[PDB]
Amino acid sequence: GREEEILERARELRERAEEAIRFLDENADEPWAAGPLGQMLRDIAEAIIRIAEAVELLLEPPTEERVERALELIAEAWALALAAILELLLVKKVEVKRKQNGDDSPPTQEEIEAAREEAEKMREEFEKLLEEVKKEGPLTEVEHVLKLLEKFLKYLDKIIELAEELASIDPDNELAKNILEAAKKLKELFEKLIEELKKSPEWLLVLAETVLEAAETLYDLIVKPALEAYKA
């Protein structure tokens, strides 16, 4: 059962992300979990939880109300994840540049807030796109979803470019390599998805399957490795 199978992936993905958040809380006293890196991993893990919960709405009896609310939750959750990934790159860029120059001291609060505010602007611009597309019509129309996915592709290009430059500044930085590899995979997944939605009669399931795979990629390549690096 394709739909039974999607519901199973969503619940398993949800449980893995919750284990991640429990890991960060049980380690709240440690400095890395309190800092910006830990909070961004939490945000990504929370975004994965929300994506999984929203997919479960899709796999219900179809209705204009639930499906559209489900599409907005998927869109806003990916908006959170891409913004958290962006802020993570921005904070690590400042960390690496400083520690290379010297000043082992952690990045200043102003540097951190500057990165948080840039990520936040990306999150707000997506919300404005969502609100304007919705007045044009419901997101249950394929063209409207494609408009949101193309915007995700734009943000993902920005992440890729920025992760490329961290990897040039710090060639041996595993977090930058993982974000770069995850961002490249998400771009391939979302481009193939834009191709398919036009010709797919059951496009909600195709969208459901793709966002689960994309969220699984965030968990497997970004979240879980960074946590395991701190256990050891």
Author numbering: 1 to 232
Quote the study that presented this structure, word for word.
Then, we tested our design approach in one of the most prevalent membrane folds in nature: the GPCR fold. The core topology of GPCRs comprises seven transmembrane helices that facilitate numerous non-local interactions, enabling them to bind to a variety of ligands, including photoreceptors, odours, pheromones, hormones and neurotransmitters. We tested 56 designs, of which 36 were expressed to be soluble, and we selected the ten most highly expressed designs for further biochemical characterization. Of these ten designs, nine were monodisperse monomers in solution, and all showed the characteristic circular dichroism signature of α-helix-rich proteins. All ten designs also showed high thermal stabilities (Tm > 90 °C). Last, the designed GLFs preserved the canonical seven-helical bundle characteristic of native GPCRs. Structurally, the crystal structures were in very good agreement with the design models, with r.m.s.d.Cα values of 1.05 Å and 0.88 Å for GLF_18 and GLF_32, respectively. This accuracy further extended to the side-chain level, for which comparisons of crystal structures versus design models for GLF_18 and GLF_32 showed 1.54 and 1.40 Å r.m.s.d.fa values, respectively. Comparing the structures of the soluble analogues with that of the reference native GPCR, the overall backbone r.m.s.d.Cα values were 3.08 and 3.51 Å for GLF_18 and GLF_32, respectively. At the structural level, we observed that the irregular local structure of the terminal helix was preserved, whereas the intracellular segment of the GPCR fold exhibited notable structural deviation in GLF_18.
